Symmetry: C2
C-alpha cells in the first residue's frame, strides 16, 4: 500500500472516489445496492498495494463523476418520468449543490509548515477566515462556526468565497519576526446571481468581509477601532483575471469587483463595520478606507495571444496614480502613498526606492504584457511594495486557489531570497541556481497543497498545463528547474473537471 | 445505389477510398494481398445500395489514411529494421509525396456551369492554367502538358500552385456579354523550402506566372505585346491570410508574397516575360507592371479574437494610397487609379463613385475588423472596383480553394444582383430574400465544388466550421438562409485531415 505512483498516487484517488460516492449517497439516501457494489470494490482496493497510475485507474477515476450523473438521471426517470434532457439538467444541478454543501460542512483549520535553508528556519501559516477570532467567536458578523465557504459556492451573498490570511516569518533570537502578511480570497462577485441588484449587493457584502479581515491583520488598528475611534486603513488589491468575455465571463467579473471597491471608497463616505468583540457581542466600528485596485492577468489567454490588456490598463492607470503620484517617469521622485511613507524618513528607504523604480520601469516598457521568463513580474512587486509602506496587500483569482496559490508561492520565494540581506532581482529574469532551490522548497512546503485538497478534495494546480502548440506555454519548466517537482505541483488537478 | 445520405453520400466516400488505395498501391507496388483484401470488400460495397452515412462508415473513412500509414511503416520495418519513430516519419513523407504526384498527373479541364434567374441566363467558367493557350500549347514557359499543380505541392519552385481564370457572363441578344473576369491562385511562397535564397527565387517565378495569366485575360494587350511593343499592366492583388505566426506560419507567408510583388514593381524596372506564341516558340515581351497588394484576413482567428490586424494594415495603407490617392476622406474626390479612370469621363461613373465611397467608409470606421454579418465586405468591393476601372483583379488563399472559393461565390452573387440595373448593397448588411436565393444558387452552381474535388478528391469547404463556443462563428447560417444548402457546401471537407 506504499508503492507510490510516479504521478497520481493511489491514495490520492482513494480519497477522491470516497468523496464523490459520499455526495451520491447523500442525494440518493444510502439505499442503492449499486452504490454499495462499487463501494465494496473500493474497500477491496483499500487494502490493495499501491501501484503506478495505470491508464485504467486514471480513466476510471476521470469518468466516475459522469457515470454518477447518469445513474442519478436514471433513478430520476424511474421515480418520475421525465425527458432525458430535463432529467440530466436537474441531476447535474442537484449533484453540484450537494457537493458544495458537503465541502462547506467539513472543518476548516489553520495550516502550518516549516522550511529550512542555509541555517535559517522559516514558518508559513495559513489562517482561514473561520479562525480569525478574538475571544471565542470569529469576528465576522455572519458567524462561520468552524466551517467555511468553498470556491464552487457561487451563489453565496453573505460570505467571501475562499478567505485566508497568509504569513511568512523567520525564527531569530528565540523570537519570530514577521516578514510578510497578506490576504488571499476569491473574486468579489457572485457569478450566477441573475438580479443585477442582488449582484451588486452581494459584491458589497463580500468586499466588506475582506476589509474586516484586513483590519484584523493589524492588531493596533483593531484595538483603536474597538476603543471607539475612527481608523484609517490603506489596502492594495490585485486581481489576476484576464478581463475578456470571449471564453468564460471573466470580463463582467472584473467590473463587478471594481464597482464594489468604488462604492466603498466614495469620497467623504465613512464605512461602518460589525465586529464580534471579545465578549461575543456585535459592535460597530468606523473605517476610513482607501483602496488601490489593480488587475493584471497572468494566463496564456492574456500573455501569449493577449486579451483584455486594454481593458485592464484603464484601471491600472488610476491605481498607479493613487500609489505613486502623477509623475511616473522612472527617474522622478515617488509621490502618492509611497511619497507619504518616505517623508517619515524610515530605515526602510532602500528597499522602497528600488521597488518603486522597478515598477515604473515595467510600466514604461509594457513588460507585463509578455512573460519574459516570469509572468508575475508586476503583481508580485505590487504586493511586496504594499507591505513595505505599511498598507495591506490582498490578491484574488476566479476561485482563489490556482492563480492565487501560484502568486502566493512567488511572493514567498522573493521574500525569503531578500531576507538574506540581498537585493532584489531584476524584472523578467529567470532565477539562478540558489533561487531555484528556494523556489522548489517553497512550492512544496507552502500551505497551497492543503488549501487545494481542502477546497476541492485533491491536491494540484490548474496553472500547469503544457499546451500542444509549444509557443502557448507560460515557461514554468525553466523557473522550476525540475521535472519531478513540476509534475508534483500539478497533482490531481487534471482530474477535477467540474 | 441511389438512397443518398443526408450528409456524406456513399458515392463520395466510394471515390475517396479508391484514391487513397491507389496511392498506397503505388508506393507498395500493387503486390500486397492485404490491399486486395479491403479492395475486394470495397468492390463488394460498390454494388451495395446507397445508405445514410452511418457513424461506422464515416469513422472507417476518416481513419483509413492513418491505418494505411501504419501499414506502410510495418512493411518498412519488416523490409528494413528501423525504429518506430524513424519509420513513421519516413512513411508519412513518402505517402504525401506519392499523393501529390498522382493528383498532379490527372487531367485538368475547363469547368462550365449555367445558372438561370428571373428569365436571365448566366454562365460561369473556370479556365485552368493548363488551358490558357494560343495555338496548340499553353502560354507558360514551363509547359503544363495538360496537367496541373495541386495545393499540396508546397515545394514546387517553377509553377504557381492552383491557378484559374474565373468568368461570369450573361447571355443577351444572341451574344455573351462578360460581366466579370478575375484570377484566383494559391499563395506565392513555397512553404517548406529551407534556403531563403530559393524561397525568394521561387516566389519570383510564381508571381511572374500570375502576371502572365493576367496578361492573357486582355487579348488586346496580349496582341500589342506580341507585336513587340512595351505594355503597361495594372493589377490588384488581394490576400486572405491572417498574418500571424502563432498557429500556422501564415505570417511569413505574407511577407514572402509582399516581397515578391515589390521586387517585380521596382521603379523604372522593366519586366521581361516568356510566352509561347501561336507557333509554339518562346518569345520575350516587355511589361510595365503596377501592382496594388492587399491583405485582409477573413478567419475567426482574425475577426473574432483578432490576429495580425496591425500587421496587415501597414500594407493596406500603402495600397489604398496607390489606388485612391492621398486623401481618404469619404466625401473627397477620388484620386490615384480611380481618378485617372474617371478623368476619361466614362459612362461607368455611377458604379465607380459608389464603390469608392463605400470603401472609404469601411476604412474609416475599421468595419473590416469585425464581421457585421458579412466578413468579405472589404475584399469583395476591392475586386469589383478593380474590374470596373479596367485593372485585373486577383485573389489568393493559403491553398487557393477554401477561402478563395468563398470569395469567388461572394463576388459572383454581387455581380449578378447588380446586373439587374440595381444599386449596390450597403456594407455589413445581410442579404434580403431575393439576394439569399441568388446566393444559394451561386454557391452550388459555381465551379467551386469541382475545383474542390479536382484539387483534393472530395467536395467541400473548410470555411464552414460551427465551432463549440457560439461566439466564435462567422455567421454564414444567416447569409445562407438554408440549413440543407449550408450542409451541402460543407461536403466531405471534414474528412480531409491531411
Amino acid at each position: 500500500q506504499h508503492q507510490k505512483a510516479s504521478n497520481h498516487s493511489l491514495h490520492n484517488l482513494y480519497n477522491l472516489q470516497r468523496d464523490l460516492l459520499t455526495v451520491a449517497a447523500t442525494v440518493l439516501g444510502k439505499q442503492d445496492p449499486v452504490l454499495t457494489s462499487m463501494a465494496n470494490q473500493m474497500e477491496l482496493a483499500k487494502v490493495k498495494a499501491d501501484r503506478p497510475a495505470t491508464k485504467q485507474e486514471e480513466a476510471a477515476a476521470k469518468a466516475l463523476k459522469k457515470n454518477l450523473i447518469e445513474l442519478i438521471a436514471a433513478r430520476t426517470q424511474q421515480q418520475d418520468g421525465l425527458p432525458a434532457k430535463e432529467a440530466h439538467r436537474f441531476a447535474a444541478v442537484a449533484f453540484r449543490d450537494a457537493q458544495v454543501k458537503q465541502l462547506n460542512n467539513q472543518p476548516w483549520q489553520t495550516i502550518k509548515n516549516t522550511l529550512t535553508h542555509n541555517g535559517h528556519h522559516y514558518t508559513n501559516t495559513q489562517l482561514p477566515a473561520a479562525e480569525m477570532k478574538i475571544g471565542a467567536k470569529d469576528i465576522f458578523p455572519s458567524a462561520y462556526e468552524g466551517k467555511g465557504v468553498c470556491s464552487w459556492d457561487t451563489k453565496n451573498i453573505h460570505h467571501a468565497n475562499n478567505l485566508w490570511m497568509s504569513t511568512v516569518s523567520v525564527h531569530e533570537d528565540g523570537k519570530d519576526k514577521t516578514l510578510f502578511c497578506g490576504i488571499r480570497h476569491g473574486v468579489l462577485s457572485p457569478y450566477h446571481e441573475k438580479d443585477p441588484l442582488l449582484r451588486h449587493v452581494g459584491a458589497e457584502n463580500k468586499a466588506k468581509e475582506v476589509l474586516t479581515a484586513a483590519l484584523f491583520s493589524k492588531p493596533e488598528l483593531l484595538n483603536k477601532a474597538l476603543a471607539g475611534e475612527a481608523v484609517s486603513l490603506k489596502l492594495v488589491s490585485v486581481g489576476l483575471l484576464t478581463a475578456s468575455n470571449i471564453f468564460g465571463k471573466e470580463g463582467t467579473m472584473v467590473e463587478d469587483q471594481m464597482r464594489a471597491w468604488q462604492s466603498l471608497t466614495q469620497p467623504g463616505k465613512m464605512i461602518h463595520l460589525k465586529i464580534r468583540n471579545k465578549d461575543g457581542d456585535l459592535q460597530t466600528v468606523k473605517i476610513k478606507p482607501d483602496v488601490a485596485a489593480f488587475n493584471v492577468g497572468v494566463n496564456e489567454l492574456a500573455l501569449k495571444l493577449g486579451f483584455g490588456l486594454k481593458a485592464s490598463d484603464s484601471y491600472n492607470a488610476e491605481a498607479l496614480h493613487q500609489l505613486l503620484g502623477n509623475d511616473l517617469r522612472p527617474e522622478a521622485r515617488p509621490g502618492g502613498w509611497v511619497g507619504e511613507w518616505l517623508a517619515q524618513y524610515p530605515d526602510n528607504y532602500e528597499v522602497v526606492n528600488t521597488l518603486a523604480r522597478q515598477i515604473k520601469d515595467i510600466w514604461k516598457n509594457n513588460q507585463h504584457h509578455k512573460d519574459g521568463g516570469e509572468p508575475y513580474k508586476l503583481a508580485q512587486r505590487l504586493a511586496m511594495l504594499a507591505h513595505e509602506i505599511d498598507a495591506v496587500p490582498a490578491w484574488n483569482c476566479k476561485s482563489g486557489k490556482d492563480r492565487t496559490g501560484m502568486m502566493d508561492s512567488e511572493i514567498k520565494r522573493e521574500i525569503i531570497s531578500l531576507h538574506q540581506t540581498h537585493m532584489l532581482s531584476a524584472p523578467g529574469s529567470l532565477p539562478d541556481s540558489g533561487g531555484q532551490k528556494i523556489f522548489q522548497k517553497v512550492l512544496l512546503n507552502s500551505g497551497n497543497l492543503e488549501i487545494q485538497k481542502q477546497n476541492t478534495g485533491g491536491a494540484g494546480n490548474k496553472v500547469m498545463k503544457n499546451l500542444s502548440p509549444e509557443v502557448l506555454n507560460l515557461s514554468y519548466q525553466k523557473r522550476v528547474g525540475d521535472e519531478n517537482i513540476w509534475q508534483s505541483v500539478k497533482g490531481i488537478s487534471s482530474l477535477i473537471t467540474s
